[PDB]
Amino acid sequence: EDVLAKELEDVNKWGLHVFRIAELSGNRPLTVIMHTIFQERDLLKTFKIPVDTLITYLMTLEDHYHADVAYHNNIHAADVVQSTHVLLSTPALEAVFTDLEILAAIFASAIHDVDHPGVSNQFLINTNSELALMYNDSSVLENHHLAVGFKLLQEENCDIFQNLTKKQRQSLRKMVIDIVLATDMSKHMNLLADLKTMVETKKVTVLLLDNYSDRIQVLQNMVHCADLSNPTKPLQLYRQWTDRIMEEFFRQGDRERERGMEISPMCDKHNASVEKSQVGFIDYIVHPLWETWADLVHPDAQDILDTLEDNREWYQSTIP
Amino acid sequence: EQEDVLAKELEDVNKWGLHVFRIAELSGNRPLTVIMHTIFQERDLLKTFKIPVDTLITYLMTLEDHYHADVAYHNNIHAADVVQSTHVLLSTPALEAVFTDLEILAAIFASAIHDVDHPGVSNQFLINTNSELALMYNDSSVLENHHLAVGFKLLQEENCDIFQNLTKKQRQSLRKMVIDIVLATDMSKHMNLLADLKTMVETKKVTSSGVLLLDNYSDRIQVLQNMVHCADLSNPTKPLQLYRQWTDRIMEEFFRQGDRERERGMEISPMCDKHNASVEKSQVGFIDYIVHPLWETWADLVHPDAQDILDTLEDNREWYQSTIP
Ligand SMILES: COc1cc2c(cc1OC)[C@H](CCCc1c[nH]c3ccccc13)N(C=O)CC2
Ligand SMILES: COc1cc2c(cc1OC)[C@H](CCCc1c[nH]c3ccccc13)N(C=O)CC2
Ligand SMILES: [Mg+2]
Ligand SMILES: [Mg+2]
């Protein structure tokens, strides 16, 4: 238990040893990382959240991530939380999202994949699942993650927002919904188009964002970047994330095959190239996103972008 | 002979101003079932889509049961009214041969399910009271998402899948169209929906047959969305004896919601305070700011097909206005 404390001192750094923390914490990475970030940002006193209510909620939330899902589990949630925490500190901003906006982005990251079944929205839609029937084929999983994340606040001693004012709770709820809904992959291109627009019309002294519409757009893109941050991490971490997403994909492709459905991209294990898929994912999705981002906050996050380009070069070299 | 009178009244199914409250009584509180069945036969939809008649009746009766008989406005009579109004709007000369049988089926089915299981309170009330529905749907088109989920879920009950003989592509296309239509009945979408309809009227293209030219999904679904939205907001365009009954019913629902808001210490929603209400001024305002802007634009789209409907709306506005001084 003291090596865990040592691991947590790198909470403000890109490349935290999140898999080690998951092992040392007894598969409680989301709980410990969240507890550490709330202390570090002084959110428990800022919003008057009792420490025991925080722990109770975090453990209940963590329990609703599936332990038999290789990628979309509590370790991924903890990673996205911690990554958002670092991006919130990019100098190109500095103290410029409200404290409520900071709490919303961090809470949204923690709940953003809760109760994920390990299959895609398209799978849930094409299989006529109960989830897709409930949500009318529209951001099916993301709507569900939000509903679960908020519903768990109503469990015994779980309301970490009990001492927020009524206005604050309403504002936070809207921001959290806006952020998590933006993690739907089908919204990526519009999100990226808007982020580009913002960069081109950027005003700085540091970024000056006067209207809520632009600020929520940045927070949406921020958590999206954090969700798509695996290829920007030290390679030892990135390779583990690749192993886990491919396990999840292959298990879904097997289900598509058996049902006679078209197999989803990268999900056919008999015609799969893991490394080519990573290079293509970086080239078409992750690098455009992170380059645009790095432009927005230029020239901060050059170290993050440096790692992404190193990792792209390495994966390409593994292709004969 | 009760059935004979009912059959006589259903001969008016192609007319604006159908005696829908009489049909509700004569059918034993089954206006949605009998009006939908009549329209499906009139449009030959059972034959076209190979819908077994017993399956249709079973689904309709189950759907109708899931409207709340104890809500004054958002009940099965309102659903039957919106269905029949959509059916008349679909028959307008300016749209002859414009929509496929599948699009027609989608618009009518959407109208039938569009308020199912409505609790008689607004989306904002459900959001502000932290309801289970608003929690499920993240404060976004809360009721309309629920109406869709219930309407589709009921197709899975015993002998209720009226779409059992559609192709897979037909079912996929119908499902998407129905979702797009019912979500457009959310009041928060009205201003953008109307702005788009105005843009279409200003840029409208007509064929050599004289009918509307709609050559992409965006334009086709937009017309169907606004059509069902007009049907939903059609009460002030109906003969006055119908309109006044709809006004009585919505005010009962509004006042009951206001009584709940008042008891909870909430600010009372507009038109919901029975101690500070003007029913007549509220109807004139509703017409002037919402219903007439919408219907004048629809009438422009299908000109001159809807002139009589617009004339009735304007007469009814003048009538309510005349009761204020
Ligand atoms: C470590 O490598 C991976 C990690 C993850 C993914 C893919 C990876 O490698 C190809 C997929 C991407 C699939 C397509 C997709 C999902 N969201 C998107 C947003 C924008 C564009 C595409 C997508 N994820 C899906 O949940 C996120 C996690
Ligand atoms: C007979 O009179 C009425 C009938 C109905 C309404 C209001 C009436 O009289 C004021 C309300 C309107 C409230 C606010 C509202 C709801 N949707 C809208 C769409 C656009 C603009 C406002 C609204 N309805 C709500 O379900 C439809 C039924
Ligand atoms: Mg997700
Ligand atoms: Mg409705």
Ligand SMILES: [Zn+2]
């Ligand atoms: Zn995620």
Ligand SMILES: [Zn+2]
């Ligand atoms: Zn309605």
